[PDB]
Amino acid sequence: ESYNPEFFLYDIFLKFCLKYIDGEICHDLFLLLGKYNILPYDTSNDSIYACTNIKHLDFINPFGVAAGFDKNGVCIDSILKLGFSFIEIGTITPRGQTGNAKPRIFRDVESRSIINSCGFNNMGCDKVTENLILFRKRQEEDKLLSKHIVGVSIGKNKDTVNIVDDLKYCINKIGRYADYIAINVSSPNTPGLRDNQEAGKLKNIILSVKEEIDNLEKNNIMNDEFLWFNTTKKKPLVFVKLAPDLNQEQKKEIADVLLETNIDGMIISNTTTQINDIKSFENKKGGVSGAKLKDISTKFICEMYNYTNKQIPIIASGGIFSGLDALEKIEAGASVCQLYSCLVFNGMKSAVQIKRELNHLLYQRGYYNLKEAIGRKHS
Numbered sequence: 188e189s190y191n192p193e194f195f196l197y198d199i200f201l202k203f204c205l206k207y208i209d210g211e212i213c214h215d216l217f218l219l220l221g222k223y224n225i226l227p228y229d230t231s232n233d234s235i236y237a238c239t240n241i242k243h244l245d246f247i248n249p250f251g252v253a254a255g256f257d258k259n260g261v262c263i264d265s266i267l268k269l270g271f272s273f274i275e276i277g278t279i280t281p282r283g284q285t286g287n288a289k290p291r292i293f294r295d296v297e298s299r300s301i302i303n304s305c306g307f308n309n310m311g312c313d314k315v316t317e318n319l320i321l322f323r324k325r326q327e328e329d330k331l332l333s334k335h336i337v338g339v340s341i342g343k344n345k346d347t348v349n350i351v352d353d354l355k356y357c358i359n360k361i362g363r364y365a366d367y368i369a370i371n372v373s374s375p376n377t378p379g380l381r382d383n384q385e386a387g388k389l390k391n392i393i394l395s396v397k398e399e400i401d402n403l404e405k406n407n408i409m410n411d412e413f414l415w416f417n418t419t420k421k422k423p424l425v426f427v428k429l430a431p432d433l434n435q436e437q438k439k440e441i442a443d444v445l446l447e448t449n450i451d452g453m454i455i456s457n458t459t460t461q462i463n464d465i466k467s468f469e470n471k472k473g474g475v476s477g478a479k480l481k482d483i484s485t486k487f488i489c490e491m492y493n494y495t496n497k498q499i500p501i502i503a504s505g506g507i508f509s510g511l512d513a514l515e516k517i518e519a520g521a522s523v524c525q526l527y528s529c530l531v532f533n534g535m536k537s538a539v540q541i542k543r544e545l546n547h548l549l550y551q552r553g554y555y556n557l558k559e560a561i562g563r564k565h566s
């Protein structure tokens with residue numbers, strides 16, 4: 188039963204690969220398998236009591252795959268069929284980029300931590316749009332994917348002067364195929380990008396992105412071909428992805444801007460540059476993921492949930508491995524969870540296992556459904 192994601196051999200390979208094989212090389216191999224549809228798949232029916240929503244986005248379960256896992260959208264079907272309800276492809280930029288010099292991704296099995304300085308390696312918005320279009324055409328005839336959601340994370344080329352130009356370019360090309368757009372102002376690996384989390388800069392960025400999406404709708408809704416070729420059949424929602432490396436004053440000013448601009452959600456959070464007690468990383472560059480980011484991002488969720496007076500839905504990212512980790516994120520304020528590091532260290536069985544653990548937890552904790560648990564830490 189090689190098709191079962193819990194098949195015993197997959198973990199044996201994984202322990203070997205995390206020990207002896209370059210991290211990005213391992214990731215390249217996974218992506219190439221997905222193209223040929225030979226990966227295992229999860230055929231379990233998800234519990235309707237663990238579904239969740241952000242506005243009209245109806246997630247069949249609360250676990251998606253975070254951005255940067257399938258940067259080019261070449262592996263969408265196979266990753267989703269592992270048991271995930273959505274994936275955020277990207278981050279994409281208008282032109283392609285090879286990113287920073289390799290090797291640039293390292294993992295620490297002991298601490299379940301990753302450090303990376305990728306630098307927005309992607310094929311560029313136009314080619315990734317073609318990859319997403321192909322998925323959307325497959326989705327239209329594969330009824331078993333008709334409720335899965337795909338968001339697109341968008342950013343800037345390294346040498347772009349005005350970030351807004353690049354975000355508008357991505358909207359006008361790929362926006363009609365996305366269920367949501369994630370604005371990436373939090374990668375630690377593009378010089379200057381995090382400066383755009385300043386309140387005035389962030390406000391202009393959000394308003395510009397929304398205006399570009401609204402103009403896309405205004406200018407094309409009369410067309411014969413239906414504009415929204417996505418899961419929702421609606422214009423994409425807009426999220427912002429924030430960095431955990433901010434002081435309390437910045438978080439509050441950002442929260443005020445999010446309230447004024449009517450952002451549809453905030454992804455909390457990106458990788459951190461403040462962890463340096465991990466010896467095998469100590470002469471390394473970039474952002475840190477995994478278990479050592481869990482507490483950092485969970486507290487950040489609590490702060491932003493309260494700073495935005497619970498008016499802005501939260502997408503949790505950071506150190507989520509277990510059902511209990513996920514429940515901490517949800518009770519802290521998140522409506523839905525994204526995984527990355529869990530996949531690297533737990534492998535093919537990641538979504539089957541975390542969904543089963545979370546279901547058992549909702550039972551033990553006396554919740555009727557998952558939505559009941561959202562923000563319950565603050566009750």
Ligand SMILES: Cc1cc2nc3c(=O)[nH]c(=O)nc-3n(C[C@H](O)[C@H](O)[C@H](O)COP(=O)(O)O)c2cc1C
Nearest residue numbers: 253254255277278303457476477504505506527528
């Ligand atoms: C190799 C690697 C590449 C990543 N690329 C992106 C990206 O392109 N856009 C983005 O918003 N986040 C990116 N991330 C951050 C993840 O989406 C996620 O926010 C981070 O890993 C924290 O989640 P985790 O602790 O579960 O791994 C990347 C992370 C890693 C390890």
Ligand SMILES: O=C(NCC(c1ccccc1)c1ccccc1)c1nsnc1O
Nearest residue numbers: 200201204210211213214217530531534
């Ligand atoms: O070591 C890594 N991956 C391991 C890889 C795998 C899967 C199965 C057997 C052996 C290895 C894997 C790919 C995709 C999801 C989960 C696991 C990794 N470091 S950085 N980025 C990454 O993917």
Ligand SMILES: O=C(O)c1cc(=O)[nH]c(=O)[nH]1
Nearest residue numbers: 305306307374376458474
């Ligand atoms: O491509 C990258 O370097 C990258 C982008 C991002 O947003 N987060 C991250 O950890 N790495």
